[PDB]
């Protein structure tokens, strides 16, 4: 995972950050098993939208993006 691509995504996340720390620390650690790979990168596109966790995509999305991790690699496999 490219922290550069992820932290940038956090920038977007920041704008949406209804929750500062959870997503902040969640996304940071997320970098380990994060969605930015060759194929997964596009998934990072959607992973970002989850990173956005807008209105209907409530902070709960944070854990959702985690679930997204499970399927994230599932797509790469």
Curated annotation (Swiss-Prot):
TFIIS N-terminal domain location: 5-77
Domain of life: Eukaryota
Protein's cellular compartments: Nucleus
Function: Necessary for efficient RNA polymerase II transcription elongation past template-encoded arresting sites. The arresting sites in DNA have the property of trapping a certain fraction of elongating RNA polymerases that pass through, resulting in locked ternary complexes. Cleavage of the nascent transcript by S-II allows the resumption of elongation from the new 3'-terminus.
Family: Belongs to the TFS-II family.
UniProt miscellaneous comment: S-II binds to RNA-polymerase II in the absence of transcription.
This protein's name: Transcription elongation factor S-II
Protein encoded by which gene: DST1
